Amino acid sequence: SLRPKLSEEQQRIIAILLDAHHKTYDPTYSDFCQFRPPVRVNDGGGSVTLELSQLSMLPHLADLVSYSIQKVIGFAKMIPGFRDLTSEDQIVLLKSSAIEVIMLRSNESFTMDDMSWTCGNQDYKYRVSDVTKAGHSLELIEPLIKFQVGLKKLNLHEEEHVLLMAICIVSPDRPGVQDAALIEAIQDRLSNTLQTYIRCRHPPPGSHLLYAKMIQKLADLRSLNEEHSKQYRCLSFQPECSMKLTPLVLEVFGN
Ligand SMILES: C=C1/C(=C\C=C2/CCC[C@]3(C)[C@@H]([C@H](C)CCCC(C)(C)O)CC[C@@H]23)C[C@@H](O)C[C@@H]1O
């Protein structure tokens, strides 16, 4: 059961990704008061008609997602090797992974205390009912919550969390990529860093089959991505939806 030590290069990769995350994820959520304000209409019955008529939480959650895409673009640019890719492949990778990295990075605000993403006072505590007030349905939200709990229970080290986000972004099997072999080389360098880290720095029993569990979460994210895309397309049919979104969100998710 060999445990090769992390190379100097692998240690540098981990330090770079930790720094990149610390520069692009504010764990105080202090910018969120700058977004359009959250509004919660009375919708205890979960009425799709009402939810679509009002889309009360959409401006705020679209601003949150847009902000988060900006942060993910910045994080990606600091992944070792990402800037070796052509501009065209960088943009394909960013647009295809954005929602997945948002789901991953949001695990840091997710809490099993009450199954919410807690980003401050009540105003910035996001629950499943807030996501339905932004026009989404249970076929996305239920698996998303299940995903957040499963990821929580892996008890990832921050090193592993940031490696997982980087591996998600640098995926050679995204539609439209040109230099799949270069993307795969970059991804393999990150994957080998992660496997090596787990084996020499993650104590048992949480280390047991941990790499395989993390790779499974990447597959789960693909399913969530596809369901989000389907639901976004239907949300976009609502008259005046575009004004509730942002230009960046429209580009990343638009048809
Ligand atoms: C974003 C981040 C956070 C929460 C993410 C959540 C909670 C609200 C609902 C979200 C945003 C899900 C929604 C299904 C996304 C719908 C987007 C849209 C309306 C455009 O189709 C995905 C992840 C969710 C907060 C913080 O962790 C930063 C992070 O970065």
Token pair of 144, please? 């998303």
Q: φ, ψ for residue 32 (rounded to 5)?
A: -65, -25
Q: How many CA atoms lie within 13 A of 156 on its CB side?
A: 24
| Unique residue bearing structure tokens 């990832």 | 156
Ligand 1 centre to CA of 49 (Å) is 22
169 lines ligand 1 (CB under 6 A): no
Please say whether the beta carbons of 81 and 145 come within 8 A.
Answer: no
Interatomic CA distance for residues 41 and 191, integer angstroms:
44
Ligand 1 centre to CA of 185 (Å) is 30
Interatomic CA distance for residues 203 and 157, integer angstroms:
11
Interatomic CA distance for residues 189 and 25, integer angstroms:
24
Interatomic CA distance for residues 52 and 58, integer angstroms:
10
Ligand 1 centre to CA of 2 (Å) is 40
Question: Residues at the annotated binding site for calcitriol?
Answer: 25, 68, 105, 109, 136, 228
Token pair of 150, please? 């499963």
- The H-or-E segment that residue 98 falls in is helix 87-105
Tally Cβ neighbours within 10 Å of residue 2. Answer: 5
Q: φ, ψ for residue 126 (rounded to 5)?
A: -105, 125
Token pair of 71, please? 């942060």
Interatomic CA distance for residues 248 and 63, integer angstroms:
10
197 lines ligand 1 (CB under 6 A): no
Angle at 221 between CA 149 and CA 79, to 5 degrees: 105
SS3 243: helix
Interatomic CA distance for residues 143 and 54, integer angstroms:
24
- The candidate with the shortest Cα–Cα distance to 109, out of 142, 64, 77, 139, is 64
> Which structural technique was applied?
X-ray
Token pair of 15, please? 């330090």
Interatomic CA distance for residues 250 and 88, integer angstroms:
19
Q: φ, ψ for residue 43 (rounded to 5)?
A: -150, 50
Token pair of 17, please? 């990704």
Interatomic CA distance for residues 166 and 112, integer angstroms:
25
